[PDB]
Design an enzyme around this catalytic site. Structure first.
Site, PDB file in Angstrom:
ATOM      1  N   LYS A   1     -12.699  27.106   0.792  1.00 15.63           N
ATOM      2  CA  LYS A   1     -13.054  28.366   0.154  1.00 15.63           C
ATOM      3  C   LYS A   1     -13.571  28.172  -1.278  1.00 15.63           C
ATOM      4  O   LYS A   1     -14.627  27.565  -1.466  1.00 15.63           O
ATOM      5  CB  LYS A   1     -11.883  29.355   0.231  1.00 15.63           C
ATOM      6  CG  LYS A   1     -11.118  29.329   1.565  1.00 15.63           C
ATOM      7  CD  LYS A   1     -11.915  29.885   2.747  1.00 15.63           C
ATOM      8  CE  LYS A   1     -11.090  29.872   4.037  1.00 15.63           C
ATOM      9  NZ  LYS A   1      -9.802  30.631   3.897  1.00 15.63           N
TER      10      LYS A   1
ATOM     11  N   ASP B   1       0.559  29.424  -1.502  1.00 20.84           N
ATOM     12  CA  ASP B   1      -0.839  29.271  -1.116  1.00 20.84           C
ATOM     13  C   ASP B   1      -1.689  30.092  -2.081  1.00 20.84           C
ATOM     14  O   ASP B   1      -1.668  31.324  -2.048  1.00 20.84           O
ATOM     15  CB  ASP B   1      -1.051  29.732   0.334  1.00 20.84           C
ATOM     16  CG  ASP B   1      -2.484  29.535   0.821  1.00 20.84           C
ATOM     17  OD1 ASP B   1      -3.427  29.636   0.011  1.00 20.84           O
ATOM     18  OD2 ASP B   1      -2.673  29.289   2.028  1.00 20.84           O
TER      19      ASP B   1
ATOM     20  N   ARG C   1      -6.648   5.997   5.659  1.00 19.93           N
ATOM     21  CA  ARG C   1      -5.625   6.986   6.006  1.00 19.93           C
ATOM     22  C   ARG C   1      -4.494   7.020   4.973  1.00 19.93           C
ATOM     23  O   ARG C   1      -3.918   8.079   4.705  1.00 19.93           O
ATOM     24  CB  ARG C   1      -5.078   6.730   7.418  1.00 19.93           C
ATOM     25  CG  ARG C   1      -3.968   7.685   7.863  1.00 19.93           C
ATOM     26  CD  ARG C   1      -3.863   7.810   9.386  1.00 19.93           C
ATOM     27  NE  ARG C   1      -4.063   6.539  10.082  1.00 19.93           N
ATOM     28  CZ  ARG C   1      -3.126   5.613  10.263  1.00 19.93           C
ATOM     29  NH1 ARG C   1      -1.895   5.793   9.799  1.00 19.93           N
ATOM     30  NH2 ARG C   1      -3.426   4.496  10.912  1.00 19.93           N
TER      31      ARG C   1
ATOM     32  N   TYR D   1      -2.409  34.574   6.016  1.00 18.84           N
ATOM     33  CA  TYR D   1      -3.610  34.193   6.747  1.00 18.84           C
ATOM     34  C   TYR D   1      -3.293  34.058   8.239  1.00 18.84           C
ATOM     35  O   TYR D   1      -2.227  33.558   8.609  1.00 18.84           O
ATOM     36  CB  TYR D   1      -4.188  32.888   6.185  1.00 18.84           C
ATOM     37  CG  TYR D   1      -5.264  32.275   7.052  1.00 18.84           C
ATOM     38  CD1 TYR D   1      -6.494  32.909   7.223  1.00 18.84           C
ATOM     39  CD2 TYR D   1      -5.048  31.064   7.708  1.00 18.84           C
ATOM     40  CE1 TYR D   1      -7.478  32.354   8.026  1.00 18.84           C
ATOM     41  CE2 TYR D   1      -6.031  30.498   8.512  1.00 18.84           C
ATOM     42  CZ  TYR D   1      -7.243  31.149   8.667  1.00 18.84           C
ATOM     43  OH  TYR D   1      -8.220  30.598   9.461  1.00 18.84           O
TER      44      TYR D   1
HETATM   45  C1  LIG Z   1      -1.430  -0.333   9.137  1.00 20.82           C
HETATM   46  S1  LIG Z   1      -2.836   0.718   9.289  1.00 20.82           S
HETATM   47  C2  LIG Z   1      -3.710  -0.277  10.462  1.00 20.82           C
HETATM   48  C3  LIG Z   1      -4.130   0.565  11.668  1.00 20.82           C
HETATM   49  C4  LIG Z   1      -4.644  -0.208  12.896  1.00 20.82           C
HETATM   50  N1  LIG Z   1      -4.316   0.574  14.092  1.00 20.82           N
HETATM   51  C5  LIG Z   1      -4.391   1.834  14.182  1.00 20.82           C
HETATM   52  C6  LIG Z   1      -4.038   2.520  15.454  1.00 20.82           C
HETATM   53  C7  LIG Z   1      -3.932   3.908  15.525  1.00 20.82           C
HETATM   54  C8  LIG Z   1      -4.160   4.769  14.304  1.00 20.82           C
HETATM   55  O1  LIG Z   1      -5.472   5.330  14.320  1.00 20.82           O
HETATM   56  P1  LIG Z   1      -6.099   5.979  12.988  1.00 20.82           P
HETATM   57  O2  LIG Z   1      -7.488   6.402  13.391  1.00 20.82           O
HETATM   58  O3  LIG Z   1      -5.172   7.127  12.668  1.00 20.82           O
HETATM   59  O4  LIG Z   1      -6.066   4.848  11.995  1.00 20.82           O
HETATM   60  C9  LIG Z   1      -3.599   4.533  16.733  1.00 20.82           C
HETATM   61  N2  LIG Z   1      -3.374   3.853  17.873  1.00 20.82           N
HETATM   62  C10 LIG Z   1      -3.451   2.503  17.936  1.00 20.82           C
HETATM   63  C11 LIG Z   1      -3.187   1.792  19.240  1.00 20.82           C
HETATM   64  C12 LIG Z   1      -3.796   1.742  16.704  1.00 20.82           C
HETATM   65  O5  LIG Z   1      -3.885   0.382  16.725  1.00 20.82           O
HETATM   66  C13 LIG Z   1      -4.062  -1.590  13.035  1.00 20.82           C
HETATM   67  O6  LIG Z   1      -3.015  -1.745  13.699  1.00 20.82           O
HETATM   68  O7  LIG Z   1      -4.651  -2.546  12.493  1.00 20.82           O
HETATM   69  C1  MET Z   2      -9.257  33.308  11.992  1.00 16.90           C
HETATM   70  S1  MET Z   2     -10.268  31.843  11.756  1.00 16.90           S
HETATM   71  C2  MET Z   2     -11.350  32.346  10.401  1.00 16.90           C
HETATM   72  C3  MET Z   2     -10.602  32.900   9.197  1.00 16.90           C
HETATM   73  C4  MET Z   2     -11.282  32.637   7.852  1.00 16.90           C
HETATM   74  N1  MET Z   2     -10.983  31.255   7.377  1.00 16.90           N
HETATM   75  C5  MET Z   2     -10.875  33.698   6.832  1.00 16.90           C
HETATM   76  O1  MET Z   2      -9.788  33.681   6.263  1.00 16.90           O
HETATM   77  O2  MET Z   2     -11.639  34.610   6.552  1.00 16.90           O
END
Ligand SMILES: CSCC[C@H](/N=C/c1c(COP(=O)(O)O)cnc(C)c1O)C(=O)O
Ligand code: MET
Ligand SMILES: CSCC[C@H](/N=C/c1c(COP(=O)(O)O)cnc(C)c1O)C(=O)O
Ligand SMILES: CSCC[C@H](/N=C/c1c(COP(=O)(O)O)cnc(C)c1O)C(=O)O
Lengths: 387, 386, 384, 387
Positions: A203, A178, A53, A106
């Site tokens: 995309k 964007d 993460r 969007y």
């Molecule tokens: C500093 S980094 C590390 C992480 C892990 N956890 C974690 C956790 C979370 C987050 O989950 P993810 O799938 O986002 O990683 C929530 N809740 C609860 C109750 C827990 O223990 C540990 O504490 O070892």
């Molecule tokens: C409204 S959810 C689907 C939208 C799609 N990602 C587009 O821009 O074409």
């Protein structure tokens, strides 16, 4: 200087166990050598990983590749484009802050901006950003951010990024662009004055229509650290497998974009000359209002654009009788996609904003793939010339 | 009714092209038969898919598996447990609202509640939730939610979920419970009166330490729709591959948890009788404060618990001289993990809150895996007696 | 426990990663010409190309190598990849192979159609009698191929007895231990030369990958096997190897519940009115129980039973709610199958009767569900 | 006629649960509706699936794509190119049969033909197949197969496939061509009279250096059934995940091959005019023997070719001082590879065959990727011009 094709095929960083392709680190946690080495990695000192993460090697590989086309200080990968948009806005905006954003965005960006941000005490105004004077008129003492899509989804409405950047720079507001529709091959917002460039990787960047992903790039180290700080708590992460696929897909981005651009222009030129077609909204056509800004601020064009039919029934007739183009939402895929904005991508958008965007049932959005252009044109031709 | 093992092995749903294993739907978008069929799905009528963010068949398969164990109306999968936590709170809490949360939580959950929520105009108070009357005193007219971890990361502090639920029902607040530590096999918060039950799937539910994920389950159909409406814009999604791996991992969950529980209990009892250990914080121990609350409200116990050493150097020596146990953060994996809360998982936590949690440099957190109990005990025995 | 060994395998972590990375790569880089040349000659540590060796795949091989007690193990794209590589790597024109009369359908297809095309003489005999192995012996006998308990009849063969004959007369013993897994059957410790599995079954256990593995007693034999695989081309994919290693983590735990479930099911079926005969090696009624009891430390959960008629078998198989009508075995959930018209449909008409396969026989593979849920599913189908 | 770009992007067959990208069928077995439905599928009646070894939907999707460029009756996918080579030869050859094969083949193909086939009572003769008369002279009453690589690995030696096909047709022998070096884009052996066309998918077709795979295509339905009948017994299968990646990689095959071809020609032309290089073996050069046959029988050229240095040490100096090109075995990857045939890919071939092949320590094999050609040329230029 070294070409971008070479840059993407040769990313910086060491190989892992001499592997040519970068391994998929399908893992949650990482092992520590000692309690100090683990303590240090949390403090920010030393090189190595803790937990996927916070940082994952194959994910970080993709981030490096994006960071390299963008010319950024750093990049953050996400589970979706909407993950990128939320973490590029809500990482900085807080109660009392004002956001100016484009009126044509969007669908789900409109949803995030009009429903979720005001709940968090954030003031939001949807403004026609094709006119810099309207942007200046909407400006307030508490304006902290301007959010732009250009060319806009789905009308291809062009905004003056460079001109708006100046106003943002003079008044201490962060500019976020964007650039999904164009790709970092043709649009590099950080060169145009933007502070944050973002994409739905789902995309063009990936291009193969098999992964949902998002990326965000920052001009500044502090800004990318804040984005990653928010991502740590918000939790929108690119999966190791998805990162592997996105990097893989990005390997061929420059050449895919070249074909996209040329195919798209030829399809648009063919449609604009066709009897059944009322209007074509491609930013590369001379007839299009925002063309002179687009050709000056971008080095090419994406292949997704909008066009006007004579009626809803005619639009329904075209969309449902194609053999090469496939009826579906999304865009920027290797194969040609086609969609009806009024009842699909922008059906959830309130009619207050719908009228000014301005999306009507006569409109059809096409995303031209990399198929032989003549095959695509012939497919549209026979559908347009039905009994 | 079917047993928990059988229910997870035979999930509700149709087979795809007669495939025994459910296919990995590695796709972004979906095709439409017609304009009307596509326009209908966005409303939505009636059966089918649009786009993976809105819904993915492989992801939905895992979601239904979690929904069946929790006894929920629906479940939503996320790219992280943090994705689940953010979406289970910020989907409901808005400017001016008040949240009461437990004082001891996972590090980033503390980070989310202390840093980000007040920026959105949300009032947050971290309260000792092991005392029910202490929650009543912390109450305000604008209180909309209570958030709980029981047993809590890392002290294993137990909260009367059933008792707090009564207060939440009477005063109009939602009860959201993080049940990561115990898993849905032993802790089903929605049976105790809670409104939302969530997990870091990265831990026990997957159990193989190879994916980051989260899941949230709501009692009512309206709440889960709102959660998924938030996920739509927030964008914390579980990847198709990760969904495949999580569902696959959840197939052995009941038998894994049974071994986790038995292993964690014997290791805790071994540590408790050892003279180099001050105290062991395991919710399944008779000595532990709030054991009776945990005994009645849960059908079992997790294998992650905390214990106290004589000094920091003693803790240092133990963690650095283990042959089987791996020094790493995270928990709920098949193999045994060990960690130092003060300088790792709970190092970014403000020193103000770290004091109230009772986290000291002498404390060590262990996550007992499904190895042979004697192998783990012997590894600890060797390291402690140096 | 074997669990500890499997959860903590031999080898160094890669960039401190807890889980071993999926090396989804074709080739590997060289530091210099000399370093690359050395690796092609066998000097030094490192990798060249995934077919010659893949780190993720080798990680699974080493897990199997540990439980088997082997000098080395080789992973393949299928169990059949393992079988053909464990035979055709050694057997050449003019050689003779004695194999059990009861084998998996495609193993019969391999030995009866392809093997004799390569000038290899093949005789299929009853290997449950050790004296019959002595009678089938010829001056050019180079290998004995075994499968015990056999697919699908569970016919048990005296492995250690046959191994003695093989060692004295200079022949390799290859044993297919798919039905029992390396948790309960370790052929190399009974005197066998090669021990192989269809990983697709118990070892992986999750029914989501096809794979095979072969373990050799000596370092020379596995080198020959890997030299053959190099040219034959049956390889385990990096992703599949990741999944198999992951599946192996719960193997001993899964096998414990497989064994107990399969026993209780067979005991239920044996006392049921609609069942003529039950072929489970763990039952005292079964002819080869004494041999199986002494040579194995446990039993698998795949076995065969006899119905009164084909109509009764059809009625049973097509009315199960929990069990699934499907080929394959050794999955976490319970599978059911009809050998005469499915797995052993291609088996020649003469070998069909020597094995004892009839349209009345139903093969079940008991998963790790609650025993009562699977028993109840069989109970309602056998009565309603 | 529909273009091959369009064909590969729109494979025939139904979509699965309306999914745009074809799902990954990561499964071992398949469920039956009834006993008779299962019995029929084993008997060959009805549709469609039983067990992944017999047929996997994801794998069959890739096979369909290959079958479409090749113009075959069917295709079979394998776990490696060597899986494809074994199953295209040993599925037909038995003891007493005679094989004629090129003297210049891939290292492990030589290993299979020299070590394994003779052990199975199969007579094998390695013959110079650039001369049709030598193939005729080596012919026997028991000759059942002619196996060709053209252009050959690594010398790029050209064989007259069309001319050899005639002899095969008149005398009742199967012609098998390994077309890995060129790709189905530029070489289609079934159009030239071959019975079976095979590829190491690990190379160009996948193109991304992340998968080991093989494919084999037959002109005849009986032959592809025989190949698949051998495959289920021999056991070389493509994994569903690998199949997904190969199909994905194949989406951009035609455009990748366009760049490979032009890059490779430009690199070869640069090397040929360079004073450090003695000779360049590219089949697209006019200096190369067999160019006239190659340009007639093929629609283009691959980008893997061999060149001669003045010494082994000079070759060592070049290979070990490149910054874009990466020193590794294999070929046909998106990025540029380089290796030393005498000590690497062809170090295992016997000395009597290696002297016949013409492989000397002075030789260097380059596999030119899709990087900007000027970057590739500049990288070689600086390495050649070192102190
Ligand atoms: C500093 S980094 C590390 C992480 C892990 N956890 C974690 C956790 C979370 C987050 O989950 P993810 O799938 O986002 O990683 C929530 N809740 C609860 C109750 C827990 O223990 C540990 O504490 O070892
Ligand atoms: C409204 S959810 C689907 C939208 C799609 N990602 C587009 O821009 O074409
Ligand atoms: C016809 S198809 C069917 C399949 C499975 N097999 C199974 C098996 C095998 C296979 O393997 P793979 O992996 O190749 O598939 C082998 N061996 C052995 C002993 C066994 O039982 C069954 O039987 O069910
Ligand atoms: C020695 S190792 C190396 C490898 C690669 N090969 C390649 C190849 C092959 C193989 O294949 P895979 O898939 O099995 O690998 C075949 N063929 C052909 C023609 C070719 O070139 C090279 O050469 O580089």
């Amino acid at each position: 200087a070294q070409d971008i094709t070479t840059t993407l095929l040769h990313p910086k960083g060491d190989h892992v166990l001499h592997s040519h392709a970068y391994p998929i680190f399908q893992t949650s946690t990482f092992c520590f050598d000692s309690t100090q080495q683990g303590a240090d990695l949390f403090m920010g000192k030393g090189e190595g990983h803790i937990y996927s993460r916070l940082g994952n090697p194959t994910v970080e590989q993709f981030e490096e590749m994006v960071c390299s086309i963008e010319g950024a200080a750093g990049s953050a990968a996400f589970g979706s484009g909407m993950g990128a948009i939320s973490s590029s806005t809500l990482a900085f905006l807080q109660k009392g802050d004002h956001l100016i954003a484009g009126d044509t965005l969007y669908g789900c960006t409109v949803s995030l901006f009009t429903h979720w941000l005001p709940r968090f005490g954030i003031e939001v105004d949807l403004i026609d950003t094709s006119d810099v004077e309207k942007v200046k008129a909407a400006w307030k003492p508490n304006t902290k951010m301007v959010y732009l899509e250009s060319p806009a989804n789905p009308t291809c409405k062009v905004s003056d990024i460079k001109g708006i950047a100046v106003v943002c720079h003079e008044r201490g507001a962060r500019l976020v662009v964007d650039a999904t529709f164009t790709s970092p091959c043709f649009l590099k917002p950080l060169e145009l004055g933007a502070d944050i460039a973002l994409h739905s990787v789902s995309k063009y960047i990936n291009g193969h229509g098999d992964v949902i992903g998002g990326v965000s790039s920052a001009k500044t180290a502090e800004d990318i650290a804040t984005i990653k700080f928010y991502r740590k708590d918000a939790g929108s992460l690119m999966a190791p497998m998805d990162a592997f696929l996105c990097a893989r897909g990005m390997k061929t981005l420059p050449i895919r974009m070249q074909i996209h651009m040329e195919n798209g222009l030829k399809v648009a030129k063919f449609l604009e000359q066709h009897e059944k077609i009322v209007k074509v909204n491609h930013p590369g056509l001379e007839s299009f209002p925002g063309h002179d800004i687009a050709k000056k601020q971008m080095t090419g064009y994406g292949s997704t654009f909008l066009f006007e039919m004579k009626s809803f029934e005619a639009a329904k007739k075209l969309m449902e009788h194609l053999k090469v183009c496939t009826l579906a939402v999304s865009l920027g895929c290797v194969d040609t996609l086609i969609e009806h904005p009024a009842s699909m991508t922008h059906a959830a958008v309130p009619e207050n904003i719908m009228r000014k965007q301005g999306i009507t049932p006569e409109l059809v959005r096409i995303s031209v793939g990399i198929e032989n252009v003549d095959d695509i044109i012939a497919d549209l031709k026979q559908a347009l010339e039905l009994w």
